[PDB]
Structure formats: C-alpha cells, structure tokens
Design an enzyme around this catalytic site. Sequence first.
Site, PDB file in Angstrom:
ATOM      1  N   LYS A  57     -29.475 -20.697  35.087  1.00 15.99           N
ATOM      2  CA  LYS A  57     -30.301 -21.840  35.463  1.00 15.99           C
ATOM      3  C   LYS A  57     -29.712 -22.607  36.644  1.00 15.99           C
ATOM      4  O   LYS A  57     -30.419 -22.905  37.614  1.00 15.99           O
ATOM      5  CB  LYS A  57     -30.485 -22.766  34.263  1.00 15.99           C
ATOM      6  CG  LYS A  57     -31.025 -22.072  33.031  1.00 15.99           C
ATOM      7  CD  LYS A  57     -31.307 -23.060  31.916  1.00 15.99           C
ATOM      8  CE  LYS A  57     -30.044 -23.446  31.175  1.00 15.99           C
ATOM      9  NZ  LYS A  57     -29.854 -22.656  29.931  1.00 15.99           N
ATOM     10  N   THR A  58     -28.419 -22.931  36.587  1.00 11.47           N
ATOM     11  CA  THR A  58     -27.797 -23.693  37.667  1.00 11.47           C
ATOM     12  C   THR A  58     -27.704 -22.866  38.944  1.00 11.47           C
ATOM     13  O   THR A  58     -27.864 -23.396  40.053  1.00 11.47           O
ATOM     14  CB  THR A  58     -26.414 -24.177  37.235  1.00 11.47           C
ATOM     15  OG1 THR A  58     -26.523 -24.904  36.006  1.00 11.47           O
ATOM     16  CG2 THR A  58     -25.813 -25.088  38.284  1.00 11.47           C
TER      17      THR A  58
HETATM   18  N1  LIG Z   1     -25.106 -10.625  38.497  1.00 13.71           N
HETATM   19  C1  LIG Z   1     -25.667 -11.848  38.368  1.00 13.71           C
HETATM   20  N2  LIG Z   1     -24.933 -12.839  37.811  1.00 13.71           N
HETATM   21  C2  LIG Z   1     -25.442 -14.081  37.659  1.00 13.71           C
HETATM   22  C3  LIG Z   1     -26.814 -14.337  38.107  1.00 13.71           C
HETATM   23  N3  LIG Z   1     -27.069 -15.629  37.839  1.00 13.71           N
HETATM   24  C4  LIG Z   1     -25.957 -16.153  37.270  1.00 13.71           C
HETATM   25  N4  LIG Z   1     -24.989 -15.226  37.154  1.00 13.71           N
HETATM   26  C5  LIG Z   1     -23.631 -15.440  36.597  1.00 13.71           C
HETATM   27  O1  LIG Z   1     -23.658 -16.138  35.351  1.00 13.71           O
HETATM   28  C6  LIG Z   1     -22.634 -17.130  35.331  1.00 13.71           C
HETATM   29  C7  LIG Z   1     -23.137 -18.359  34.604  1.00 13.71           C
HETATM   30  O2  LIG Z   1     -24.444 -18.632  35.087  1.00 13.71           O
HETATM   31  P1  LIG Z   1     -25.011 -20.129  35.095  1.00 13.71           P
HETATM   32  O3  LIG Z   1     -26.006 -20.228  36.219  1.00 13.71           O
HETATM   33  O4  LIG Z   1     -23.844 -21.077  35.042  1.00 13.71           O
HETATM   34  O5  LIG Z   1     -25.794 -20.120  33.693  1.00 13.71           O
HETATM   35  P2  LIG Z   1     -26.348 -21.448  32.988  1.00 13.71           P
HETATM   36  O6  LIG Z   1     -27.731 -21.192  32.549  1.00 13.71           O
HETATM   37  O7  LIG Z   1     -26.300 -22.695  34.001  1.00 13.71           O
HETATM   38  C8  LIG Z   1     -25.327 -21.799  31.535  1.00 13.71           C
HETATM   39  P3  LIG Z   1     -25.712 -23.449  30.909  1.00 13.71           P
HETATM   40  O8  LIG Z   1     -26.817 -23.356  29.936  1.00 13.71           O
HETATM   41  O9  LIG Z   1     -24.426 -24.061  30.171  1.00 13.71           O
HETATM   42  O10 LIG Z   1     -26.138 -24.385  32.146  1.00 13.71           O
HETATM   43  C9  LIG Z   1     -22.345 -17.472  36.780  1.00 13.71           C
HETATM   44  O11 LIG Z   1     -20.946 -17.681  36.990  1.00 13.71           O
HETATM   45  C10 LIG Z   1     -22.848 -16.293  37.580  1.00 13.71           C
HETATM   46  O12 LIG Z   1     -21.745 -15.550  38.097  1.00 13.71           O
HETATM   47  C11 LIG Z   1     -27.551 -13.203  38.705  1.00 13.71           C
HETATM   48  O13 LIG Z   1     -28.720 -13.337  39.111  1.00 13.71           O
HETATM   49  N5  LIG Z   1     -26.928 -12.026  38.797  1.00 13.71           N
HETATM   50 MG   LIG Z   2     -26.397 -24.918  34.001  1.00 21.27          MG
END
Ligand SMILES: Nc1nc2c(ncn2[C@@H]2O[C@H](COP(=O)(O)OP(=O)(O)CP(=O)(O)O)[C@@H](O)[C@H]2O)c(=O)[nH]1
Ligand SMILES: [Mg+2]
Lengths: 392, 86, 205
Positions: free
Chosen positions: A24-25
Amino acid sequence: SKEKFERTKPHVNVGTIGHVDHGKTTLTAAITTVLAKTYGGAARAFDQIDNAPEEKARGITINTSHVEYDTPTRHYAHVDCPGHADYVKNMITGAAQMDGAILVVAATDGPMPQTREHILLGRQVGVPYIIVFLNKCDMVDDEELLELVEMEVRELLSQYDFPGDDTPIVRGSALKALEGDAEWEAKILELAGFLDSYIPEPERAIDKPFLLPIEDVFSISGRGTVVTGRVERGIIKVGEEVEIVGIKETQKSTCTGVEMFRKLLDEGRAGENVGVLLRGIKREEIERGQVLAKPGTIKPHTKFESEVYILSKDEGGRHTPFFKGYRPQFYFRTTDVTGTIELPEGVEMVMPGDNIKMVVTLIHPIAMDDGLRFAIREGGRTVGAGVVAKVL
Amino acid sequence: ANIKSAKKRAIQSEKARKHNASRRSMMRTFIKKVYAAIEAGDKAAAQKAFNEMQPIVDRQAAKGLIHKNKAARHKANLTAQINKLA
Amino acid sequence: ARYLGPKLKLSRREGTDLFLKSGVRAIDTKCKIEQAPGQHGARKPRLSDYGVQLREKQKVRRIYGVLERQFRNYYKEAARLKGNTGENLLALLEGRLDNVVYRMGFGATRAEARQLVSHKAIMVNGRVVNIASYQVSPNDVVSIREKAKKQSRVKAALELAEQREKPTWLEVDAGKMEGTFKRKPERSDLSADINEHLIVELYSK
RNA sequence: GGCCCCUUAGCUCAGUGGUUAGAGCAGGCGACUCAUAAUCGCUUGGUCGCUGGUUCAAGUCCAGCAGGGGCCACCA
RNA sequence: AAAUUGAAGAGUUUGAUCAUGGCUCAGAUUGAACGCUGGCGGCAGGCCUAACACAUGCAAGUCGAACGGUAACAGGAAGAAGCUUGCUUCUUUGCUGACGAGUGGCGGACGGGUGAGUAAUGUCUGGGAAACUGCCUGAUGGAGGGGGAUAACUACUGGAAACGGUAGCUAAUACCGCAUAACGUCGCAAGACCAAAGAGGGGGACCUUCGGGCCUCUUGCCAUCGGAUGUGCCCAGAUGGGAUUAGCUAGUAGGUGGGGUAACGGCUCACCUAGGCGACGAUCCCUAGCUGGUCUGAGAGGAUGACCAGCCACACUGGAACUGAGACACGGUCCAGACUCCUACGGGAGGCAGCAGUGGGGAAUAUUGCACAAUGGGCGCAAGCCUGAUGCAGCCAUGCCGCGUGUAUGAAGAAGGCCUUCGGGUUGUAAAGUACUUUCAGCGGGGAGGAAGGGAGUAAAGUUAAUACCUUUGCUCAUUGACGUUACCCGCAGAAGAAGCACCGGCUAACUCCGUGCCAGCAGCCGCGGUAAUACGGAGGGUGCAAGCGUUAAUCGGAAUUACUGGGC
Ligand SMILES: Nc1nc2c(ncn2[C@@H]2O[C@H](COP(=O)(O)OP(=O)(O)CP(=O)(O)O)[C@@H](O)[C@H]2O)c(=O)[nH]1
Ligand SMILES: [Mg+2]
Ligand SMILES: *C(=O)[C@@H](N)[C@@H](C)CC
Ligand SMILES: [Mg+2]
Ligand SMILES: [Mg+2]
Ligand SMILES: [Mg+2]
Ligand SMILES: [Mg+2]
Ligand SMILES: [Mg+2]
Ligand SMILES: [Mg+2]
Ligand SMILES: [Mg+2]
Ligand SMILES: [Mg+2]
Ligand SMILES: [Mg+2]
Ligand SMILES: [Mg+2]
Ligand SMILES: [Mg+2]
Ligand SMILES: [Mg+2]
Ligand SMILES: [Mg+2]
Ligand SMILES: [Mg+2]
Ligand SMILES: [Mg+2]
Ligand SMILES: [Mg+2]
Ligand SMILES: [Mg+2]
Ligand SMILES: [Mg+2]
Ligand SMILES: [Mg+2]
Ligand SMILES: [Mg+2]
Ligand SMILES: [Mg+2]
Ligand SMILES: [Mg+2]
Ligand SMILES: [Mg+2]
Ligand SMILES: [Mg+2]
Ligand SMILES: [Mg+2]
Ligand SMILES: [Mg+2]
Ligand SMILES: [Mg+2]
Ligand SMILES: [Mg+2]
Ligand SMILES: [Mg+2]
Ligand SMILES: [Mg+2]
Ligand SMILES: [Mg+2]
Ligand SMILES: [Mg+2]
Ligand SMILES: [Mg+2]
Ligand SMILES: [Mg+2]
Ligand SMILES: [Mg+2]
Ligand SMILES: [Mg+2]
Ligand SMILES: [Mg+2]
Ligand SMILES: [Mg+2]
Ligand SMILES: [Mg+2]
Ligand SMILES: [Mg+2]
Ligand SMILES: [Mg+2]
Ligand SMILES: [Mg+2]
Ligand SMILES: [Mg+2]
Ligand SMILES: [Mg+2]
Ligand SMILES: [Mg+2]
Ligand SMILES: [Mg+2]
Ligand SMILES: [Mg+2]
Ligand SMILES: [Mg+2]
Ligand SMILES: [Mg+2]
Ligand SMILES: [Mg+2]
Ligand SMILES: [Mg+2]
Ligand SMILES: [Mg+2]
Ligand SMILES: [Mg+2]
Ligand SMILES: [Mg+2]
Ligand SMILES: [Mg+2]
Ligand SMILES: [Mg+2]
Ligand SMILES: [Mg+2]
Ligand SMILES: [Mg+2]
Ligand SMILES: [Mg+2]
Ligand SMILES: [Mg+2]
Ligand SMILES: [Mg+2]
Ligand SMILES: [Mg+2]
Ligand SMILES: [Mg+2]
Ligand SMILES: [Mg+2]
Ligand SMILES: [Mg+2]
Ligand SMILES: [Mg+2]
Ligand SMILES: [Mg+2]
Ligand SMILES: [Mg+2]
Ligand SMILES: [Mg+2]
Ligand SMILES: [Mg+2]
Ligand SMILES: [Mg+2]
Ligand SMILES: [Mg+2]
C-alpha cells in the site's frame, strides 16, 4: 513564507486498503512519483510517509497518512491506512472520509483475512466505490493463476453487494514503477485513468449549517491549537464564531485560520480536508470525536431508540444471541462509545441476522440528530448497523 | 547591527577612531619631548621644545580633539617647571 | 432593579398604609391590614432596638421606592451637607423627579409617575428628562409634552389629586398641565409619622 | 495515537478450574439503661470492576471496555 | 461667605457574684480567586507567580536647497513606421521633474519596558562652589588665498555565503598647511600662540570665452562674552530587623611634591607622620527600589507603595572601551561563556523586562486589530516622509454609577399546594379577566462636534535700481475623520425579548409539618443530633440584598489588648 491555494479543478478524496505487506505505501509513493514526473510537483518519497521512529524501526504503518496529487482534470487527497488487525480504529477513521478506495491484493498471496475485513468494514461504513489493483506482477509471470486470483477477488467483492462483474482490475508492480522502469510505469497511468473515469463527481451541499467532525489535533508553535478534518456541509470563514460540541461540555470559540496542505486559504467549503486554527483553546481541552459546528444548530444526547439489523454467519457476525445488559461499542462518524442495550418488551432472544427496534443509552453524550447512521462492534467483530430513529 | 543606519555609524566610528589616534600620538610625542628636555637639565633646549609644542596643542584644542582647559593645563605646568630650573 | 411583587404585603408588614395604591377605595376592602403576611400572621413580636430601627428605615424606603445602595448614597450626601442630617435626607428624597410628578397629581401612584417619566412624557424647562432620580431645583417648570396630553391616565390622576391635601411648595395649572417649584419643603410641611433620628442612629453606628 | 501494570464483605487480606468464595477486626437483634461502654443469649453478610467467548465445569483461561498509574511518539 | 460636625457595644470561665485576662462577632477597603446565576449602557482597570525559554510580522529614519551622479519612472529633444501626412511604432539624449545605491549632515543617549540588584555610592527636605552644555536666543567682530586624497565608477580576481583583494579615475559644507587676529589662552610684566564654507531665488543698466561678473534678498560658516535649559560634584538632618553579630581599618586617616579630570578631591603614584570609625551601635547577617500619595482611624497613630506623576537602577551572563555636546549605549562595536541554529566543513548567525502572539509555572489576568484625522516627537526652506508614542476599536459582571424587566383596576377572597381545634386559615389583588403605555432591545429614515490648518489666486504695505523674487496683513475659490451604520432626533409593531442568591436557636431581621434517631450530618463563637429536633435533610411560609448574591484569602477599627494623647507589679 506562506503561499496561497487556488481552486481550479474538482476535488476528490481517495485512499488505500488491504492486507498487511501487500504494497500500500509503495503504491502511494509510486503514484506521486510518476504523476509528478509527467506533470506536477509532488515527488513524495517512501520514508517521507512512514516517518515516525517506530514505523522506521519495525517497517510497518501505524497511523494514516495524507498525500496530494492531481491529474489535469481533478485534485486528489489520498489517505494511506494501516493493515494490521489491531490498528483497525485508525483505518475506520481514515475510511470514513473516502469517496472511493483502492484495494491492493498481492498476486503471490491472494485475498487474505484483512482483505475480507477491510471489504466488510467498507460495506458497513458506506464507501461508494472500490478499484482493485493487483500487485507484485513482476514476481509471478504465469498467466493462469492470475485468473484464479482475479476470480476469487471478484466473488469476494460480489458477496458484499459491491458490483463484482463490472469493477475494473489493473495488473502492475509498485516497486518497479517507483524504481523507474518505463514498462511498468504505464500501469500507474492506467490506474489514474480508471480513477478519473470510474468515480463520478459527487455532490457537495454548501447551503446548510456548517459542520466538521474532528479527527486530529495539533499544537503549532507560535500559533496554537489546530484541528483537522473533512467538512461535512456548509462553509467556514475566517473570523466566524464556532461551537465545540461533543462528549465533554460545550465550548465557544472563533476561527482564525484555514489551510489545506500547508497552503493558505480564506474559507473552506464542503468536501475539503482542512485544518482550522482556534483562538484561546488548550490542547487537552479538545479531542477526536467532537464536532465543530455553527452555534445553536446541533445538540448532544445520550439516550435514544433506533432501527437496526444484525449480521449473521458467513459475514463475521455472532454465533450466539444476546439479552439485556449487553454492552457493545457504537461507531458514530469518527467516534466509538460503549452503550447499554434495552430490547423491546418480549422478544428476548435475538436471532443472529434479524431486525429489531432497540433503545440504547450511552456513557457520554454525542452530537446527534434523527436519520444518523452508525455501526456496532465489539472484540474485533463487527455485528451490525442501524439508523438513529428517535432521540429522547 | 540589523538596521540600515547603525552599520553606517559603525563604519564611520571606526574611521574616526583611526583618524584621532594618530593626532593624539603626535601631540603626546611633542609633550614628552619637552619633558625629556627639562629632565636633562639644559634650559635652551626646553625653551625651544616648548615653543615648538605650543601651536600644536592650541590647534588640536581648536579642532575638538581636546578641551581648552587641557591645553592651558599643559602650558601652565611646562612654563612653571621651565622657569623653575636655572 | 425594581420591586415587581405584591404591594399590599409591604403595608401589612409595616402595619400602616403606604399610599401604594390609587385611593379610589378604602384599603379595608382590599387587604386585612391588621395582620402581618404569611401563615404566622396573628402572632406578635417583641422587637428590639435593632428591629425598630430596621423597620423604620424599610418603611421610608418602601414609601419612596429606593433601593439600599442609592439610599446609602443619599445618607452620605445628607451627612456631608451643612445642617441636620434627617432634614437634609428627607428634603433630598423629596426632590427627585418621579416624586414631584406624583406630588402634583399627574400619576395616581409613584409607579405611575415612574413609568410616565421613564417613557419620555415629561419636560423640565422645555427639555426632555428621562431619569427618575433627577434632582429638581427651585424655580423649575415641569410639564407634560404636547404629544402626551391625550391619555386618560393623566386626567384620572388629576381627578384623584384634588381630594387630597395640597402641597404648599408647588404651583400647578391643570388646564395647561404645568407645575413650578418655589423652594424645598421644610420638616413641618411633611408628615410627622416619620422619626429620622432612627435612620441616623442606624446608619451612624 | 502506541505499549505495559492494578481492581476479591464496611477495612486489611487468603483463595492455582470439581460447585453454598473464606479469616481477623468491625457490624445486627433480645435482656439492663433516658441512651451508651462492660457484662449474658442468638447471628447476617459480597454485582469476585463490567460485557462477551472457550470448556461438562470460570474469581481462575481468551478478548473488548470503564477507572487509575508508568514509558514513547506525531505537529495545518 | 465656605473650606468644617468629633469618639456606641455584644457572646463565652461560675451553683450564682465582682474583677482580671485571652478568644469570637456587628464596619470600611482589594490588581482579588472560587461556587450558583446573568438584560443594556457610561467611565475606569486587567501575569501580583518563572529578571523562565521564545516561531513570525511590525516598533527609527530623513535631507537633491552640501556632492559626483542615473538603476527605475514620467516628460522634452533628434532620427523614426504608418495613416485618421506624421494619427501611431522604434531608437540616442540626465535637458527637466524626480530618484536605487554611494560620500556628507542631523537624529539614533528622546520616546517605550521591567523592579533583578541597592539600607545608602540611592531617595526626601534645606543649603554650597571648584565646572561643562547640541538645537533656541542677545551683543560685537570676521568670513583672504592654496593643496594632496578617496567612496561610488572601470578592468582583473578570492569565497557556499557573510563578505573581500589588486590596479586606474573623480566631487564637495569631506580632509590638511598658510595669511589675519582681538575682550581669548599661557606669563608679574615684556612677549609668544590659536579659526572659518558655501548654497538658493530674482533682476534694470554695463563686460561677458559669453559659464559668470554686478545689484539685491534669504539661509547657512568661524571667534569671544551673556541668557535660558540640561547635566556633573560637596555638606547637614531624616529614611527596616538581629547583640544567641563588639570590635573594624594599610590608600587605611592626614601632609608634601609629580601626574590626571570639564571641575574640587587618595582620583592616582613616590615619600613623611600614626592615625581614622565604634554602645548617639561601627563591622557582620537577613529582608527591601524611594517619594507625592493610598486604605483605616474622632484624633494621635497603624498598614501599605497596584494605576497616574517626580527620582534611581537594569537590558541573555561576565568584562572593556570607541564615536559624540551628551552613552561605558534596549532594536550599536570588541572579547569570553551557556544554549538555539545554517554550512559545500573552510566559516558564519542570534538575543521580546518594545506592540501583538506561543509553551511552561500558577488559585488567577485579554487581539498575531484600525489610523496617522487630533496632540506630541525626528529630518526637511517647504510640500512632505517616519512614528505598536498616541488616538480608537475587540475580550473580561474586575470595580464605580445610571436604567429596565411593565402600569391601573380586579373577590370567585377561584383552582392547586401547605397548616388545621375539621369550623376554617394562608399563599393573596397574587393569578386569570378588563383597560392603557412603549423607555431599553428589534426594523426603517434623518443627523451635530471632535478641523486647527495646508493649497491656488488677488489686493495692500514692507524691501530695493526695480512694480521682479521674498516677508507681513485682508479677501476670494475648491478640499482634509480611523472611530463610523458616531452622540442625538423622527417613525413602526407589540406586554410583547429580559430574576437570582444567602438566610430564619442566641449574638441578629425572619416558624411550622414530615423523614431520621449521638447514626447521617451542621458549626464564626457558645453549642445541636441518644425515638415528639423553631439548630441535621426536604416542603410550605417569611426576612435581607439584587444583575448580582455567598465563600476563602489580606489590612485597619472595635482593642485603653504595647497605654505619647491613654495601663500596670
Ligand atoms: N517485488 C515487489 N515487492 C514489493 C512490491 N510492493 C511492495 N513490495 C515490498 O514489500 C515490502 C513491504 O511493502 P509495503 O508497501 O510496506 O506494504 P504495506 O502494505 O505498506 C504493510 P502495512 O500494512 O503495515 O502498511 C516493501 O519493502 C517492498 O520491498 C512490488 O510491487 N513488487
Ligand atoms: Mg503502509
Ligand atoms: C493540514 O491541516 C491538512 N493538509 C490535512 C493534514 C488535514 C487532514
Ligand atoms: Mg505477508
Ligand atoms: Mg506479500
Ligand atoms: Mg514485518
Ligand atoms: Mg507469506
Ligand atoms: Mg605660525
Ligand atoms: Mg446596580
Ligand atoms: Mg427504671
Ligand atoms: Mg470565658
Ligand atoms: Mg454552666
Ligand atoms: Mg471562645
Ligand atoms: Mg472583618
Ligand atoms: Mg465567577
Ligand atoms: Mg507569564
Ligand atoms: Mg512581574
Ligand atoms: Mg536616494
Ligand atoms: Mg506603552
Ligand atoms: Mg526611559
Ligand atoms: Mg528592585
Ligand atoms: Mg512601579
Ligand atoms: Mg548620598
Ligand atoms: Mg582634489
Ligand atoms: Mg592617482
Ligand atoms: Mg583630484
Ligand atoms: Mg576661552
Ligand atoms: Mg588669559
Ligand atoms: Mg594672563
Ligand atoms: Mg601683554
Ligand atoms: Mg606673535
Ligand atoms: Mg593661524
Ligand atoms: Mg578656506
Ligand atoms: Mg554659525
Ligand atoms: Mg560659531
Ligand atoms: Mg564659538
Ligand atoms: Mg547656565
Ligand atoms: Mg541651571
Ligand atoms: Mg603610599
Ligand atoms: Mg596633589
Ligand atoms: Mg599639579
Ligand atoms: Mg528585591
Ligand atoms: Mg513626587
Ligand atoms: Mg482609637
Ligand atoms: Mg478619611
Ligand atoms: Mg505610591
Ligand atoms: Mg500591589
Ligand atoms: Mg505591572
Ligand atoms: Mg546594555
Ligand atoms: Mg535567554
Ligand atoms: Mg529573558
Ligand atoms: Mg554587556
Ligand atoms: Mg570624546
Ligand atoms: Mg549633558
Ligand atoms: Mg541604542
Ligand atoms: Mg531608550
Ligand atoms: Mg529587543
Ligand atoms: Mg509581549
Ligand atoms: Mg530583555
Ligand atoms: Mg497550568
Ligand atoms: Mg489551569
Ligand atoms: Mg494592529
Ligand atoms: Mg516602518
Ligand atoms: Mg501601544
Ligand atoms: Mg458592564
Ligand atoms: Mg468599522
Ligand atoms: Mg430574632
Ligand atoms: Mg444550614
Ligand atoms: Mg420528628
Ligand atoms: Mg426528645
Ligand atoms: Mg478579617
Ligand atoms: Mg490602639
Ligand atoms: Mg482584629
Ligand atoms: Mg503612660
Ligand atoms: Mg492591665
């Protein structure tokens, strides 16, 4: 220093939801990066959003975050929400002001428990539209399990009355788009186009008495206490006089400043997400869940009776009835309050999934009027929803 | 200095200090010349040193660097001591 | 800042008519004057010196319709003057505007005169004065404005006035509705039912 | 906004799921007194902080809340 | 004429008494705070605590009539497109008004804030001699002739920035000699010595390289002696507590000589003498800005120094001088310290006890407002520019004062509460019912004073060669208000929009019923409550104050209870 904010395009509120670690972030940062690259000036990085020390240490999201961008037709304020099961209150507060959400589902995992919980809460709070974005497509290269994920997402959405066969779904990867790969950056623009087309222009009521639900409080050095939120109806002008009505005793104040993303305004209309600066208010005198209203317009109450529906199985819900003395939590706008139940005479046992006329008394007063919608929850389980019928 | 009238005053004051120091130095030089001539014991050298000194203190008082009473004090003391010795 | 309650109770408690109604009817038919107000009415007290002084002060104040702060100011003034304190106090109460308007038969009661003066219907020397406590000086002319000569209240009061003892320091013309002082009244010109020395002893404690 | 502690009769405290939750100090009634203390004869007491789950079985095990205490952030 | 009219007691030690002696009450006042309640207006007042730390915007400039000049603006001129043949466009020109930066003059030492330090280096009352003094003002004089530089500017160049460096050139009321010099300074005299600057307006005749000379007027420049204002210095008396602080002092007390100061002086040095202060309280410790005045009191006294005015001291902490008529300088300089910052890592930046505003401390104290229209201040010949001084507005029942919340009639002595001897009594003319009025609040229409001056023209009188310029006196003509929808007046509708708090055993004004039963509770002092409570809690009735009413804190009075007036062993 301070510049000024000019009004040139319709303004919309969006945000992100989904299971934890589905991206999401990363998506939130990638959207601003790509759009600012094409046109604009946002360029808001990843650590500029998850900025608190515990977030940087444990690598998660605890709060909600606000960013802004704009396609050359609209102006978007975007809210990023947590995904953990024990931060749900912040997600509810954030999603109470959404004109439409983006559901992030990773192709590696598929739908997960928090995906379903977010969908259910978006149903019960009243989010009008949902766009689906399928993430981490750079990892999975097969073109057969993607169909499985898309299908499962479709009936999951349809089961909660959201239009499943007609909602758009986009494939992509936020990490590659943020890095700079020109191939994956097209999916961001496709998402932006669907965001411009699927979501219509909502109606703003600006001829009614002013009302603003308070969701966050700050203390600005040299200036004083600032309260932020989304204007429900009406207009607030600098110099006008306001009422703080809520679970404490009522207070009087004056407005001495309005801003939107640190840009100076002169009056905030319905639908904007603004911060208001009050005069002569201390920071412990105020709190999330109160109402900033036009004086002598709305009033607080504690006891009322309502019409309500109870959820059932295959919907969360409860597997057991309840009786007198029941004390769940009621969510009003941006607030939750414990209340005591009173069933109508007779009909003691309550079936899981019927309607009922109940009377309820709250432990704190709430700014209330007839025809107000609320939700009912306890212990991590949503149980129903109702409409305020009569106020005593 | 954070007002665009004190900076000019500071610059002007520094220049005026640098200007006044040299005039004071020269005046003191001639005064102590007369004092040394008295200390030696000769009477003609002291008299000619005093005659060279007197216009300097008169003019320097007239320009505002010292007061008239200061110049008169110097002249009186030097005349008294010069006429004291034989 | 006015008393707006039942009026016969005050005269009942003072045990003496305070001229607080019009006078069309004897007050025997209106109240039982012989009783103090309330459940324990027929019961009788045994007043002390404080009681009698307080009762006398209250009776004068209720006669003239003045509250305690402004009465205290009146006493301080009278004590500052050169003469007798009681004479000065009584003459000073007798000089306020609404009392003079009542005293020359324009209002039936003191509250009548109060409302006539407060509603801009009175002139002193061709100038509108809207204040009750206005001290009036000798050789002043008090009149009703031309716009206010058509009310029935004024002629009803004028017809209630001449069946009463005429003051010897006012000159009145009812046809033109004019009145004039000559000078302030003396002690012998006012009722002897008032002992002002009790007032002085209460305030000069 | 996040995390961590405590809540058994009027008071100070026992009680580790097997079914009237107990101890001491206090208290209640009868005889004496105008009324007590003391002397004699009989003695009653709890929302186990509240609501909901798991278990045949909950003060005890699992969650949410209320009241109070202690650490840590965010700044239109 | 007047400037004075002034003095009160009560409760409580005992079985009862007289005395002694403490405690408590009745009054006035406040920069007040808290609880309950709250209509309008006038005039005032509003961080007493952390002299704690402070984001942001404002609080000190002005003169072109001293000067070289042209970055901006507008005019004028000359080349210049086009046509409504020069309508309209462009370019070169400090030629003119004006003017960013720069040299020069004046102001920034005033105005505004705070009370930390300070028991006397301060303040108050009364005197003195050894001194300086910008701007303003009086008198008498002068106002000749030369010189060498430099900022800005041009060329090159260092630095992230703040800010520099090298080389050329130029002006002045900027800077430095010469001449002249007296009532000025030094000296017994004889003698010796010291200064200065120009600009602005108009013009008949005469020479103009034709810039000016020349006449006239205004303002400035130097010296000396006065006036007025301000400032420095000396002396006497007075100005808290502690003796469980009795001795203190080495530049210390005096003298001579040299220096220093605007001026006297151990002010400072070298030497000589051995002194100086103290129970009339020295030295040491604690606390504290002083006064006119304010509260109380019959007076004598006691307590106190918030607002207004006179004096003093301080400016993040600790030292120091420079410039100037005046400072050891709130929005100046230099050095050191603790904090808060920027940085390209070499170095830089800051100081709300100015006006608003924030956090913190507290029982507690306000707007990041409008205007220079009036008064006052700085610069300017003036027009004028600057002014968080000042004039106004916002908030707060914090205080004083004024007004309103209707007025007359009305017995059925109505209903309903409460008491009852069951007959009745009381709330109570109170309400309803009837007839009038319209202050204040609401709506619409009119409308003072705070405004004096400044500008343009004209006339007369001064001045002079001059009817020109300039000054003085009259007249005429157009304008200058933040408050502000001002004060106030006129009209409209309608009793319509407006009453609470403490108390009822004695002191001390005001009494009954029910509940409880030395329990729950009250209390300023005596004291109430143990099953028939005027004292606790509710109700009915009454008393006192009133947009306020109670409580707490603090001072004097009563207290003759520190007694001088005026007490005792
Ligand atoms: N290979 C790949 N990795 C991804 C992608 N999007 C995110 N990630 C990996 O997942 C990790 C965590 O993703 P994040 O965007 O923080 O997830 P989140 O939904 O914000 C977790 P929260 O719910 O606590 O906010 C990141 O460090 C990133 O490396 C993607 O499209 N491809
Ligand atoms: Mg997040
Ligand atoms: C700031 O006040 C505004 N941009 C957001 C944060 C209000 C939700
Ligand atoms: Mg995962
Ligand atoms: Mg994943
Ligand atoms: Mg993780
Ligand atoms: Mg996994
Ligand atoms: Mg010579
Ligand atoms: Mg009043
Ligand atoms: Mg017996
Ligand atoms: Mg006694
Ligand atoms: Mg006794
Ligand atoms: Mg006693
Ligand atoms: Mg007292
Ligand atoms: Mg209050
Ligand atoms: Mg403070
Ligand atoms: Mg202070
Ligand atoms: Mg200039
Ligand atoms: Mg001031
Ligand atoms: Mg001062
Ligand atoms: Mg002090
Ligand atoms: Mg003071
Ligand atoms: Mg002295
Ligand atoms: Mg030259
Ligand atoms: Mg040269
Ligand atoms: Mg030259
Ligand atoms: Mg001289
Ligand atoms: Mg001489
Ligand atoms: Mg001589
Ligand atoms: Mg001579
Ligand atoms: Mg000579
Ligand atoms: Mg000479
Ligand atoms: Mg010369
Ligand atoms: Mg001169
Ligand atoms: Mg001169
Ligand atoms: Mg001179
Ligand atoms: Mg003098
Ligand atoms: Mg003098
Ligand atoms: Mg010596
Ligand atoms: Mg000497
Ligand atoms: Mg000497
Ligand atoms: Mg002090
Ligand atoms: Mg004085
Ligand atoms: Mg006395
Ligand atoms: Mg007095
Ligand atoms: Mg004082
Ligand atoms: Mg004070
Ligand atoms: Mg003060
Ligand atoms: Mg200083
Ligand atoms: Mg500091
Ligand atoms: Mg400070
Ligand atoms: Mg210093
Ligand atoms: Mg000097
Ligand atoms: Mg001076
Ligand atoms: Mg200064
Ligand atoms: Mg000053
Ligand atoms: Mg400052
Ligand atoms: Mg301030
Ligand atoms: Mg300061
Ligand atoms: Mg506090
Ligand atoms: Mg507080
Ligand atoms: Mg302002
Ligand atoms: Mg300015
Ligand atoms: Mg001010
Ligand atoms: Mg008021
Ligand atoms: Mg206005
Ligand atoms: Mg009594
Ligand atoms: Mg009581
Ligand atoms: Mg009883
Ligand atoms: Mg009894
Ligand atoms: Mg007292
Ligand atoms: Mg005494
Ligand atoms: Mg006393
Ligand atoms: Mg004696
Ligand atoms: Mg005695």
